Amino acid sequence: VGEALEYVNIGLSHFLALPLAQRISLIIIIPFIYNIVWQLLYSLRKDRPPLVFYWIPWVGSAVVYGMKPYEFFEECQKKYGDIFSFVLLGRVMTVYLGPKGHEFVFNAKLADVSAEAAYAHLTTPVFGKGVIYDCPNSRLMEQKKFVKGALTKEAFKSYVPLIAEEVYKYFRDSKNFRLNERTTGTIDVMVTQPEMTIFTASRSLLGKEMRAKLDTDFAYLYSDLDKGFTPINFVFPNLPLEHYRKRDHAQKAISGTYMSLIKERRKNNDIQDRDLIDSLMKNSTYKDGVKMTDQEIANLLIGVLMGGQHTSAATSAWILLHLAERPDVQQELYEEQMRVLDGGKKELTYDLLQEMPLLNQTIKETLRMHHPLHSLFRKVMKDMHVPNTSYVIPAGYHVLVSPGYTHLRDEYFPNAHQFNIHRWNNDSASSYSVGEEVDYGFGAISKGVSSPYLPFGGGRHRCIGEHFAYCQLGVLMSIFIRTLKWHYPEGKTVPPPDFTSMVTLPTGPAKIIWEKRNPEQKIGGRH
Numbered sequence: 221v222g223e224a225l226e227y228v229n230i231g232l233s234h235f236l237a238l239p240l241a242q243r244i245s246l247i248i249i250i251p252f253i254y255n256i257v258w259q260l261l262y263s264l265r266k267d268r269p270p271l272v273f274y275w276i277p278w279v280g281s282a283v284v285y286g287m288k289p290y291e292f293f294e295e296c297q298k299k300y301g302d303i304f305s306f307v308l309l310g311r312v313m314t315v316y317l318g319p320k321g322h323e324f325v326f327n328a329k330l331a332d333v334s335a336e337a338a339y340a341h342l343t344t345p346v347f348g349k350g351v352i353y354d355c356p357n358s359r360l361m362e363q364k365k366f367v368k369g370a371l372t373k374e375a376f377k378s379y380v381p382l383i384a385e386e387v388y389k390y391f392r393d394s395k396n397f398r399l400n401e402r403t404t405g406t407i408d409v410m411v412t413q414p415e416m417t418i419f420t421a422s423r424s425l426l427g428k429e430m431r432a433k434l435d436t437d438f439a440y441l442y443s444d445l446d447k448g449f450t451p452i453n454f455v456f457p458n459l460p461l462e463h464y465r466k467r468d469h470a471q472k473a474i475s476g477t478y479m480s481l482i483k484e485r486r487k488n489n490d491i492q493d494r495d496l497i498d499s500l501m502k503n504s505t506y507k508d509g510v511k512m513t514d515q516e517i518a519n520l521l522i523g524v525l526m527g528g529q530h531t532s533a534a535t536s537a538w539i540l541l542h543l544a545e546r547p548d549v550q551q552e553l554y555e556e557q558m559r560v561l562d563g564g565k566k567e568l569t570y571d572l573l574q575e576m577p578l579l580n581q582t583i584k585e586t587l588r589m590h591h592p593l594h595s596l597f598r599k600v601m602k603d604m605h606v607p608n609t610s611y612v613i614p615a616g617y618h619v620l621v622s623p624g625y626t627h628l629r630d631e632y633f634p635n636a637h638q639f640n641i642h643r644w645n646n647d648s649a650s651s652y653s654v655g656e657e658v659d660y661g662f663g664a665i666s667k668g669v670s671s672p673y674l675p676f677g678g679g680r681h682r683c684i685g686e687h688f689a690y691c692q693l694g695v696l697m698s699i700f701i702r703t704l705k706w707h708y709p710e711g712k713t714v715p716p717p718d719f720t721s722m723v724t725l726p727t728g729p730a731k732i733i734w735e736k737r738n739p740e741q742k743i744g745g746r747h
């Protein structure tokens with residue numbers, strides 16, 4: 221026995237004396253073996269969801285999850301049911317699929333899970349300090365209340381002619397169109413739609429000055445910041461490379477530009493109700509009396525604009541891509557436009573937009589088939605018991621909810637991979653609570669989150685951009701439809717999504733051919 225412990229020490233001594241070829245080998249062999257041995261032992265636990273088996277330690281199932289997460293989820297669901305875990309670049313992700321998973325994650329108690337712990341490294345290096353996920357949840361709650369204050373029906377009534385003007389200016393001036401000189405052409409929708417999205421969102425949310433900045437070489441800083449918004453930040457939020465230096469420079473340069481305008485407005489008492497900058501200047505005091513700083517206001521503007529940027533641009537790209545092979549839908553949308561707008565002799569308004577159910581259904585169905593965020597995360601902060609099961613999700617795990625997966629299940633949407641706006645006949649609203657409501661600090665929202673359709677999430681982290689997105693996408697598509705027909709180049713079809721980008725944007729290049737419905741039509745104004 222004691223003789224055995226001497227040979228332990230002797231063996232530790234011969235271990236250290238191995239050739240570095242074998243020391244390195246054992247430094248790879250041993251973690252690999254322990255990994256398999258640990259999973260086998262882990263698979264015995266009754267109080268843990270099944271864990272997806274994986275060969276490479278730390279890396280885990282990262283590759284297949286990034287490649288095709290919904291296909292990854294469907295196979296895991298067939299072997300294990302609706303709750304299962306997998307490891308992901310160092311973390312254990314516990315997936316809860318379906319409406320009860322929406323309920324488990326979106327309505328989790330604030331003490332149990334943390335969104336800022338999952339997201340802060342993704343967003344803080346892009347947006348700046350102090351806001352969104354670089355702050356306590358109750359600060360986020362009031363930030364959402366401040367922003368929502370500029371997102372009112374009356375705000376939407378004035379945004380509509382502004383967004384319309386921007387769309388027409390883009391048809392007139394952009395290289396991709398020039399409708400006054402060309403009656404047909406080919407565009408890449410991942411080129412045109414990010415540009416149309418930033419032009420229209422700038423003009424309406426940021427205001428006339430910040431929109432004017434985009435006609436200068438200042439627009440290059442927006443490109444730099446936009447490039448810093450990448451899921452690489454989940455792993456490498458700060459690397460001493462040039463990518464990160466352009467991003468950081470841009471955040472300072474852009475937030476400096478907003479602080480410049482904010483300070484000029486306050487210095488001149490020029491604070492109105494024009495844009496979200498005005499609104500946050502008048503309404504950014506937290507409930508404990510602390511005011512947001514001009515730096516925090518500008519970082520919140522960056523965040524709101526940048527999140528809205530990627531979700532909205534991806535969605536209008538998909539709308540265009542689904543309609544390019546559906547000339548029947550384009551025709552039906554065109555007729556609705558002629559009826560609602562008296563043949564075009566009525567100007568588009570926010571209220572008339574609400575009388576365009578097929579247009580809004582087309583947005584709604586695109587968001588069904590293309591949730592821009594396939595996976596939403598929380599870090600588990602206290603152990604969580606999974607109701608009706610033996611499972612306990614321990615602190616340090618992550619929970620993963622995926623309403624976009626349920627969007628594509630035939631159980632809840634018959635023929636789920638068919639694009640059919642008519643599945644929403646009589647139900648064209650962007651969403652609506654099926655019953656009771658609750659207020660986390662930014663307005664009463666649906667208490668239950670068991671709806672199989674959840675493009676905007678639910679609970680305390682629920683989107684507040686839904687009506688701005690519909691207003692923006694609504695004006696934009698109304699004008700596209702009334703102005704152009706479009707179709708695919710020959711043999712091309714809807715592309716598959718890129719599930720490794722920030723949003724589930726289409727795999728490019730994704731080109732459509734447009735044509736003027738009225739070749740002789742000319743867009744006025746000066747260029």
Ligand SMILES: CC[C@@H]([C@H](C)O)n1ncn(-c2ccc(N3CCN(c4ccc(OC[C@@H]5CO[C@@](Cn6cncn6)(c6ccc(F)cc6F)C5)cc4)CC3)cc2)c1=O
Binds near residue numbers: 285342352526
């Ligand atoms: C390593 C080998 C490699 C090979 C090649 O496979 N590989 N292997 C694996 N993968 C891989 C695997 C998975 C992924 N990602 C999964 C995670 N996704 C993701 C994206 C965004 C997320 O957003 C978090 C918040 C929520 O709200 C937002 C956004 N927002 C809401 N409304 C408007 N904006 C928000 C809110 C408020 C604001 F004010 C602002 C905001 F922005 C931000 C959360 C999750 C990205 C894709 C990527 C790659 C690989 O590439």
Ligand code: HEM
Binds near residue numbers: 528535678
């Ligand atoms: C197609 C358009 C959009 C979709 C599908 C969408 C989706 C979502 C989802 C699913 C969440 C919840 C994330 C989570 O629970 O982890 C969210 C949150 C949020 N979104 Fe959007 N969004 C869209 C557009 C916008 C726009 C246009 C804005 C701003 C103008 C915006 C601002 C926000 C904010 C401020 C939050 C709250 C983040 C939090 O509380 O953690 N979104 N959105």
Ligand SMILES: CCCCCCCCCCCCO[C@@H]1O[C@H](CO)[C@@H](O[C@H]2O[C@H](CO)[C@@H](O)[C@H](O)[C@H]2O)[C@H](O)[C@H]1O
Binds near residue numbers: 372493499
């Ligand atoms: C006897 C018949 C007489 C008929 C009288 C008719 C009165 C009509 C009154 C219209 C009310 C709209 O008036 C005003 O609209 C603006 C929108 O630009 C709103 O402004 C709102 O959106 C803007 C733009 O994001 C934000 O900067 C602002 O913080 C927000 O509150 C005002 O909060 C609202 O007060």
